[PDB]
Design a binder for this molecule. Structure first.
Ligand code: S62
Ligand code: S62
Ligand code: S62
Ligand code: S62
Lengths: 492, 396, 396, 492
């Protein structure tokens, strides 16, 4: 029945008047100014990502301020995301900053700290103390973004591995390393992260994009690192290796969402398996009711070219068809030449794919997996979305203080916009990673506690009127969950 | 339910024992020799494509002869296809050259035509006319290259034997994001019609001069398989490329991986829900034959087909096991190379009798499945001769 | 799936905590006194029927007064119904006597009419005319007694407030086996329309003079409930019978037993599959409210209804729990007595305020369900005011 | 969707050209002559039941001969059923053949054999040795078809029960007794049965209607009593009490079919519960794929009246709607006044109900309960019937030597006739209790072993042509199961 829906499509018919997918932009040189962040919002940015791989706290403080000021000038709410550096496995130094590794040659990798600066083509340092304890003969070591492949022959001692060089490649100082068939037990957060996170709390960030997540226990470590004052910040887990993939179920349970880092996974896993891994992860998140980001290598060529390749375009479309809440831009907005154009084009592709997407298959698929008896909240939200399909309603209004019920509704995928009416600002921002949802702040301090709920509902319906989703005569499905309620409202 | 099926998947499991999707390679400078063609076959080529936009009849004649030699030396059957040069505007359907070329194809005994620039339904009748009565058995696959082909897709499919989505050609007028969507449309319309569809141009292009393709190119091929394409096509990658064998082998690997992830039952069920009641007998037999694969968890189907018709009918319903087609016409073997999920076995009547009680043909099919590791003793296997007959056989 | 539900049944299990089907008793010589009527109520009577084929307006006036006294003394609400004497032929719809009688019914404030011998749709408008503007709120239940009523059933249902299958009358022209089948038809058409239907005549007749009925009579009543009848009717058994209380009590026992065997979900689902998309809001709210009973296994519904309309709308979808209707009009309580699966609670506005925030009404409904043992702490309960609203309430 | 099907019905439209339900007639005084058995066949008798409660072997030998000669004269095949007497609990004798039991009075029932002839209102004999060991205080004893109810107060000794008489009723010599809340452990077959069965084998009867079945173990006892030469005779279990009902699952597994004896069950169980018990038993049999007979009190009033009551008519119709393969006539044909008329009317009622019956609900319901993976045979038969619905075929041809695959097909309930083509005569008779199936004998001895199957198929299709179910152009679904096969045949 996606198939059936395909039969009735016409590419000349008008696209939807709404875009369900959300866009995350990485901020850097090309876009850190208030006037550029402004052009980014208008192009369709909902989330601003700061990459703490680079920059000092000083640089990001500017991004924060520039974001908060861009948003407030445009009257909108924009999420601020902190993407951590995370633990790294790297080489040490080489004599003459360099070491020409030739295919067939033998070399020795050592965890012996003495060799940190005096590396040679023959014996050099890798900074991960457990290397020997975790690698075994036959396994591979990737150095320099997977380019250099060394095969492990044996242990020279308990600190040194004898390796065959399997392919020629020159490598220089401090290259990154990957262990494709190895369970890496680095801690969850690096000493730096712990400081960067602490900073994030202090500065009131919305979500952590947590690097190199490999197990559920590690999500706890990240949480415990955000400490007692960080309990409302969302942890979005970056899945970057086989471990993340193997442990996905338990990781999804503990976390608040998922980022599929295709490029990182790609270093260690064949591209065609990463495609499939994207499918699995997006679908698990859809079923769990948690946002999922499709990240890296999205419209990469458009970092320096005016238009992207055909294949990059289908890549973006097919992330939407897979079920991504979000698509992310990295270099294309951090240091690209067409930062507005890329966001605009991404929005257009998403919008096109959404018009081809049969949402009803999602609703069905997710509803079919519910255990009977359902809990009240699951029942109210799914029947609310069912009511949309059955009455052809044209908007939904969701009253939610923490975003929870808005995410519960969005999970069921109605074929019309969801308007969340909330009394928390951080909620309006945090929902920026949830597909199909738009927020409205309701100031309970100034406008009253609305214990009746009539004002928030009215605020909801008016919001949907200005945007032109509903007009007089259309239907609109209202929901307050947690005590609960549902109404099918005729619009006046 | 593709969604539910995704939930159960592991990328660390072993891949399926067979690849369903089919690879078409354009022949050229890199690949015209008997040996290079042998490499192509072993790498995963099912169909040799001659681009008649280049080279003389002598060049192409050489392609045909070498393909035949390479295949016969390897003991397989390879399809040969003629891709015509061709002409909101309307020029004639076939050009004068096209008409000359098509006649040549018939004399040489090509298996199918890739008709360029098809824009409407009578244009197919023209290609059919130009092939004359001696080319009546030759498949016509229509290349959809502009908005008119898209607009008139329904009637074009009705008349043709299949479709090719030419993404690159379509992309000149139509924005890229819309080609993606048109790809979905055309593939699904063809799946429903039960006719082969080829996803073509811009497949793994960077691999024409690079040893490995881009990640985006990889998902393109996989998503073509997920869309429902029977076939994926290589152009420059094999004709003038530097890595012809590597590109084919990779395309095969991508397809096998995608297929492990693909839920065939979603296809079966979606296509079944569309059948009008009452069904005709051929339709009912084939759908319910595939239905029986699912209900009994049969590990292979065996289809007796002379013209390949009932083979394509079974394949349309997308069983989750290999389909072995047993046939008396070597042309059917070649032609079934554009139909996903099917492998052919030639039964030589002139050398083994007419077998009008079907026992021997059936036995050759089951033996083939046994030899390919699809079924062993105690597995079920669904046999269909469509006059028609289903049989659920316990394999001994 | 009634089939699958049958598989899981045990006749040795305890019966359901409530009876859904409703019992109508004809009043007469055996049962006209205040005490006898009290016996009838306690035995299971929901609706007193006056046969206006017999007795004067004085006789019937006595029925009305005694019924009112008996009910008020017991603290329940009993519906009063006027069954008119009435006229391939066509006489007029109402006779002169009928017209006089109907006017009398309005003055007295009867709850519903049982219109004899209805043969077509305008004939209903006539009954409606004869009731005048002061009887606009009175339900008209059409008695289908011959082939014309059967033939014109669709349009008759459209205009009426409900139907009565008069098996005995129908049986004079139509062979018995066909009446059985016509019973199925009429009941199902009414279930779909969402209007009450009464199965009447020849119910437990041998029990007019025998202390127990025949086994066949017993399955007749049970199969009426299985067909989907809202109501079952006693005629001579209670009017002139020897065992009026025993017959009612037995009818109740048969109904309770049948209902334990009945799968309500088959009804819900069958009726749902028939709704045209898009549904209007009232329809969608009620179907999905019942849907929520099933999905959450709620143990009771609470419906706020002033005219009983949304109560009959919910009841149409056949939840598998009791429906408690809270209402400001005592007439609604009486009228809902011909609707299966519903029990009413009177909310007196003049004594408790308009409760336009609905809290107090809802609370009286839940308290009623608590008191009847339907829900306890931790059970779910589905509340609906249809402007409209569903709520899934956790009972404290 | 029976509901939906009801919406489209018109009682004036023509009834089906075929009757799926089968009719069992008890033979006695009114119908034992060859010319009466002939009028019974023409009225619609498929099965002739002999009630070994009455008559000597001599009387039944006549019924047998008269049946076999009636059938052979009409060219048809008719089943011969032996209904056993079974174990009985009875009283002994009373002084003056009588004892006036008055309500409130006390009495003593004893298993003491000495009291066999000298029973009084005060103390009398009941012939079931285990009575005391199985009854306990509070339980009831029914004497004389449930009319007299005695309540058990206590044990006078280990052989004698003290009883309150709960209602007045005079009782005479040798009245039957029932123990409504007691697990009666009488053996499966009485000494007489053992002789009657032995006779049945010898005389080649088709099916045993086995009385008072209470457990699966007892079906084994009946089987073992039919001995080695009786292995192809069908055992149809009569369910007559709470035990039969409680043990139904295991009883159905061991037996070849079920008779719902409503009157017998009625002695001990309230009528409204018997209605429901009928529902359960018919449905279990439908799912098991085994014939079920609806028996007793069917058209009883028509034993002496020309026409039956309305309620008896709906009783018969609703047995068809419940899913009965068969409806049975007892006294109405054994000793009634209108033996032809009753059979004719029964046939008419069945035919009417069948036209109202949506068979597709049955097919669906039964198919939905199949375990996946199915076994080949289950798959072939269900898909064959599915093919009927999908192609609107108008007959089925089933090649079956033992009837097994014909019963497997019939279980799935196609909406068209099933023609079984068989090489066994006992098979043609034994299928007389299976709804929707007609048989044809194929003489493999004389016409050849047809290992191709083309002749039997041809015999099938021609049989369906003469009956007018199929004409040139219609579809017909053919099946050989056990190796197997299915064909959708276009009729020439
Ligand atoms: O100034 S730099 O060019 O060093 C620079 C600074 C910040 C970022 S963030 C990213 S990302 O796209 O990889 O996330 N790239 C860069 C590059
Ligand atoms: O001899 S050439 O190198 O000119 C040559 C010959 C044949 C073909 S076919 C294709 S295509 O499939 O990529 O369009 N390109 C070429 C190039
Ligand atoms: O006083 S009488 O005994 O004549 C008498 C009075 C009223 C009624 S109502 C019915 S009926 O419901 O059975 O048709 N029978 C009678 C009989
Ligand atoms: O000659 S008798 O009237 O004694 C007589 C003989 C045989 C049978 S068989 C039945 S049955 O209908 O109960 O099965 N009743 C009778 C009655």
């Amino acid at each position: 029945s996606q198939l059936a829906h395909n039969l009735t499509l016409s590419i000349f018919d008008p696209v939807a008047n709404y875009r369900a997918a959300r866009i995350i932009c990485t901020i850097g040189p090309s876009t850190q100014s208030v006037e550029a962040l402004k052009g980014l919002i208008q192009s369709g940015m909902s989330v601003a990502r700061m990459n703490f791989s680079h920059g000092s706290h000083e640089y990001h403080q500017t991004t924060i301020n520039n974001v908060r000021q861009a948003a407030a000038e445009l009257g909108v709410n924009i999420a601020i995301a902190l993407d951590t550096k995370g633990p790294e496995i790297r080489t040490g130094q080489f004599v003459g900053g360099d070491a020409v590794m030739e295919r067939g040659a033998t070399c020795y990798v050592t965890t012996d700290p003495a060799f940190a600066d005096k590396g040679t083509k023959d014996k050099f340092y890798i900074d991960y103390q457990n290397l020997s304890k975790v690698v075994r003969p036959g396994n591979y070591i990737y150095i320099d973004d997977g380019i250099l492949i060394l095969q492990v022959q044996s242990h020279e001692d308990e600190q040194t591995l004898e390796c065959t060089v399997t392919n020629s490649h020159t490598i220089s100082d401090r290259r990154g390393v990957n262990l494709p068939g190895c369970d890496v037990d680095l801690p969850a957060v690096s000493a730096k992260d712990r400081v960067d996170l602490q900073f994030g709390v202090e500065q009131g960030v919305d979500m952590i994009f947590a690097s190199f997540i490999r197990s559920a226990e590690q999500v706890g470590d990240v949480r415990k690192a955000l400490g007692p004052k960080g309990r409302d910040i969302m942890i979005i887990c970056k899945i970057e290796n086989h471990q993340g993939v193997q442990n996905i179920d338990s990781i999804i349970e503990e976390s608040d969402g998922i980022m599929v880092a295709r490029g990182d996974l790609g270093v260690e896993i064949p591209a065609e398996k990463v495609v499939v891994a994207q499918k699995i992860l997006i679908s698990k998140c859809n079923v769990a009711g948690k946002p999922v980001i499709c990240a890296t290598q999205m419209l990469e060529s458009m970092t320096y070219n005016p238009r992207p390749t055909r294949a990059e375009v289908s890549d973006v479309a097919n992330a939407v068809f897979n079920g991504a809440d979000c698509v992310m831009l990295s270099g294309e907005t951090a240091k690209g030449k067409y930062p507005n154009e890329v966001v605009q084009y991404m929005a257009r592709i998403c919008l096109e794919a959404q018009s081809a997407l049969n949402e009803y298959v999602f609703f069905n698929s997710i509803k079919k997996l519910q255990h009977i008896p359902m809990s009240a909240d699951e029942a109210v939200c799914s029947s609310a979305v069912n009511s949309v399909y059955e009455t052809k309603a044209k908007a939904m209004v969701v009253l939610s203080n923490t975003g929870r019920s808005a995410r519960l509704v969005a999970k069921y995928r109605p074929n019309c916009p969801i308007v969340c009416v909330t009394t928390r600002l951080q909620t309006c921002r945090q929902l920026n990673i949830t597909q199909g949802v738009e927020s409205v702040f309701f100031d309970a301090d100034k406008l009253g506690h609305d214990e009746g709920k009539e004002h928030r509902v009215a605020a909801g319906v008016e919001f949907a009127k200005s945007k032109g989703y509903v007009q007089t005569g259309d239907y609109c499905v209202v929901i307050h969950a947690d005590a609960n309620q549902t109404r099918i409202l005729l619009v006046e």
